[PDB]
Amino acid sequence: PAWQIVLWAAAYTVIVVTSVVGNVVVMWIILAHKRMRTVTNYFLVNAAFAEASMAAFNTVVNFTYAVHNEWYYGLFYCKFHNFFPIAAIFASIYSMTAVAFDRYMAIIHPLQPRLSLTATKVVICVIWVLALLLAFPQGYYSTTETMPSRVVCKIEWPEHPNKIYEKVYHICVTVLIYFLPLLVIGYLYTVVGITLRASGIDCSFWNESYLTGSRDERKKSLLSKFGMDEGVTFMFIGRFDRGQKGVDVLLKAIEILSSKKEFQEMRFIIIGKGDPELEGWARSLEEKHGNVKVITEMLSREFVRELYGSVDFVIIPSYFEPFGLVALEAMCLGAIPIASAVGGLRDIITNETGILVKAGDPGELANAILKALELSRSDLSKFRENCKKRAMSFSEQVSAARKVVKMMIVVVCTFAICWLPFHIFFLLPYINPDLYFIQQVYLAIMWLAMSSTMYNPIIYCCLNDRFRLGFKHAFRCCP
């Protein structure tokens, strides 16, 4: 069916041209602009070079040899045709693995040193050396030979009764360039994507701009709704439990403070439900003291935003706070956090943006509450401004990192999809020989696998403003 061959040749040429043009433009965008020269972009340039080289130097003969099963192209090209794609795919997928590892280090272990640019050039050279070494056996054993009357290019391992070495080599290459790097990148981006999503906040909602009036009028109206007169107002919200959210630590701190004269000047609002003994202890402290209020009913997020914008301080005595979104919610609304120095709370709150204490120590928490009462004698506006600025700038870095990580996840998923049918096609004989319309299926599977060399520049242009601007500059001639 010659018309099908014409359509297939057109599709393969579309692969070649799109891959070469887009990857060359990506290399120009990164290398020619000093702002673009980063660790991540260097690994991306290495991957773009590997993919453009494979599309430029293998696609045409792969198509022609798949369509016309006689080798006319010489011995050295037979070796290169069996050698280069393994090295190129290895170099590209491990450049992507290095990008994911650099992101995981910057986000999960910020204190630990990362690669310098020269270190990344060294890593890229090591990657290419390992790629060439892994590809070497397949190119070394390739030869042209009559089979028995017409020339073919074929991999000829030394004759062994079970061909065990060639089989183990193929399995190892498939693991090293597909399954293992995908598992590693999947772990890295799962941890990173969960940690970033758990640290995000909706700034369109948790925003002081939707409150009305001065903070003092709001706090007075709130205390009046609770039946209390004006005072320095502390708020807790969370589940009542032992060993987790710390409401028991806050209740012990309230009992410690209750004997002091300073307790007269404080007000407490404890919101949550859970362990009945803790609920009964909170109701006992509420009836015992006129400056304590407890709310076990569920509240709307609008009412909680009103509370965050009215109270003076929010107490977060968590034993365990991996992400600390509640601290961002309070700080965005101008409440000053008083929190255990654990996890995301320790990462977000600073000495200038809150008060931090050891988790599980009621006496240190009572001392921090007394320190907050001492701070309340003076104006707190600069403190709340620092809390708001810190919460905004933190949210901000999280959002940009989420964009970059989403782009890289789209890249890795496109790679996994494009290469799965190819490796399945070459692993099927080991579990079921079959292979008896195979040529039409092979042209489709090969087209999909090699199409992977053209998607990344398209992906960068859609999901990255800098690459989009670089593509606009490269194509300024066009409308």
Ligand X SMILES: C[C@@H](O[C@H]1OCCN(Cc2nc(=O)[nH][nH]2)[C@H]1c1ccc(F)cc1)c1cc(C(F)(F)F)cc(C(F)(F)F)c1
Per the annotation, binding residues for CP-96345 are 170
Q: Please count the helices (runs of H) and the strands (runs of E) in the chain.
A: 17, 8
Q: Give CA 392 to chain center in angstroms.
A: 20
Residue among 71, 96, 123, 170 that touches ligand X (CB under 6 A): 170
Q: Using the rule CB under 6 A, is 238 a contact of ligand OLC?
A: no
The span from the CA of 340 to the CA of 332, in Å, is 19
Options 171-179, 216-224, 272-280, 471-479: segment touching ligand X (CB under 6 A): 171-179
Residue among 19, 41, 174, 456 that touches ligand X (CB under 6 A): 174
The span from the CA of 306 to the CA of 183, in Å, is 45
Q: Give which of ligand OLA, ligand X, ligand OLC, none residue 369 binds (C-beta under 5 to 8 Å, depending on kind).
A: none
Nearer to ligand X by Cβ, of 101 and 141: the residue is: 141
Q: Give which of ligand OLC, ligand X, ligand OLA, none residue 373 binds (C-beta under 5 to 8 Å, depending on kind).
A: none
Q: Using the rule CB under 6 A, is 140 a contact of ligand X?
A: no
Q: Quick one: DSSP state of residue 158?
A: P
Rounded to a whole number of angstroms, the minimum distance from the CB of residue 362 to ligand OLA is 24
Q: Are 24 and 412 in contact (CB under 8 A)?
A: no
User: In which residue are the tokens 């003994």 written?
Assistant: 277
Q: Using the rule CB under 6 A, is 459 a contact of ligand OLC?
A: no
Nearer to ligand X by Cβ, of 77 and 169: the residue is: 169
Contacts with ligand OLC in 186-205 (CB under 6 A)?
193, 196-197
Nearer to ligand OLA by Cβ, of 76 and 210: the residue is: 76
Q: Give CA 142 to chain center in angstroms.
A: 41
The span from the CA of 327 to the CA of 347, in Å, is 11
* DSSP 3-state of 274: strand
DSSP codes, 429-454: HHH------HHHHHHHHHHHHHHGGG
Ordered alpha helix ranges (H), 32-74: 39-67
Nearer to ligand X by Cβ, of 93 and 369: the residue is: 93
Residues 30-69 vs ligand X: string with x where CB under 6 A? Answer: ----------------------------x---x-------
Structure tokens at 243: 């060993």
The span from the CA of 8 to the CA of 439, in Å, is 12
Contacts with ligand OLC in 3-22 (CB under 6 A)?
16-17, 20-21
Q: Give which of ligand OLC, ligand X, ligand OLA, none residue 387 binds (C-beta under 5 to 8 Å, depending on kind).
A: none
The span from the CA of 96 to the CA of 102, in Å, is 10
Options 124-132, 250-258, 379-387, 404-412: segment touching ligand OLC (CB under 6 A): 404-412
Question: In the chain, what's the furthest Cα-to-Cα distance?
Answer: 105
Residue among 314, 380, 387, 405 that touches ligand OLC (CB under 6 A): 405
Rounded to a whole number of angstroms, the minimum distance from the CB of residue 23 to ligand OLA is 8
DSSP codes, 281-338: HHHHHHHH-TTEEEE-S---HHHHHHHHTT-SEEEE--S--SS-HHHHHHHHTTPEEE
Q: Using the rule CB under 6 A, is 61 a contact of ligand OLC?
A: yes
Which residues contact ligand OLC by CB under 6 A? Answer: 16-17, 20-21, 56-57, 60-61, 193, 196-197, 402, 405-406, 409-410, 413
